[PDB]
Design a protein around this ligand. Structure first.
Ligand SMILES: O=c1[nH]c(-c2ccc(N3[C@@H]4CC[C@H]3C[C@@H](OCc3c(-c5c(Cl)cccc5Cl)noc3C3CC3)C4)cc2F)no1
Lengths: 11, 224
């Protein structure tokens, strides 16, 4: 579940 | 009797929810491309992974979602994405303005007939409710912030984030529709119906899997 955490907390 | 706090919480969610835009080069593929089963599966995959990008970029904007357990906030999307894709597709299929083409592509994309019937039964059922865009937007946010999700540790913490949305939606049902006090009860009944679809959706994937290629993002939510 890397991309969801990556796509979260983005400017 | 709505408050200015609720009115500004509705305003944020709506403009967070109206920002959804299907990219032009996908939406025009629905008509321009052929209706082969493999091509139908290809387009449906792109729309799914795109709406998931849309979905994360509407959920992180939900007030207080970022202020939660990293592992539990991930678990919400895992268990709410399928139901929020059903709710967003149900809105487009019952909107009065290409819906008919996408339906034909879904019906001819390799899905077993056991899952087609409930799917469009639900779409029809949702249509008879004649929901506003405010109800679709609030319902999507309510669906995501669910306290009884699986693999959830702080269930009581989620309750604090959901209850206000339910409070707002309940007022709207009493305000805009006094000629029907069951509208709010029937709205909440669709969340119950979505659970059935959410849980026997991995079987729909299974049949699709034992035959194809999913995107990494779609593999990352549906456990493939
Ligand atoms: O602004 C906008 N938004 C849209 C718009 C938004 C969402 C959708 N559907 C498409 C794409 C996302 C969502 C649900 C459905 O997803 C395809 C889909 C589904 C599915 C279905 Cl088969 C029914 C209900 C729920 C799900 Cl998960 N299950 O798998 C897929 C992909 C893998 C093949 C079809 C279709 C749209 F046209 N259009 O304009």
């Amino acid at each position: 579940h890397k991309i969801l955490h990556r796509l979260l907390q983005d400017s | 009797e709505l408050t200015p706090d609720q009115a500004t919480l509705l305003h944020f969610i709506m403009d967070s929810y109206n920002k959804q835009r299907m990219p032009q080069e996908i939406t025009n593929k629905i008509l321009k491309e052929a209706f082969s089963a493999e091509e139908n599966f290809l387009i449906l995959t792109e729309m799914a992974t795109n709406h998931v990008q849309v979905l994360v970029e509407f959920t992180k904007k939900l007030p207080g979602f970022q202020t939660l357990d990293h592992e539990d906030q991930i678990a919400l999307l895992k268990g709410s994405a399928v139901e929020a894709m059903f709710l967003r597709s149900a809105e487009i299929f019952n909107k009065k303005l290409h819906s008919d083409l996408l339906e034909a592509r879904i019906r001819n994309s390799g899905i077993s007939d056991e899952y087609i019937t409930p799917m469009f039964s639900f779409y029809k059922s949702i249509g008879e409710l004649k929901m506003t865009q405010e109800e679709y937007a609030l319902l999507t946010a309510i669906v995501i912030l669910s306290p009884d999700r699986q693999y959830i540790k702080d269930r009581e913490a989620v309750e604090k984030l959901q209850e206000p949305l339910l409070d707002v939606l309940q007022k709207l049902c009493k305000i805009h529709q006094p000629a029907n006090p069951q509208h709010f009860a029937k709205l909440l009944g669709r969340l119950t119906e979505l659970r059935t679809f959410n849980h026997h959706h991995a079987e729909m994937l299974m049949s699709w899997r034992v035959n194809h290629k999913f995107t990494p993002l779609l593999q990352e939510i549906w456990d493939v």
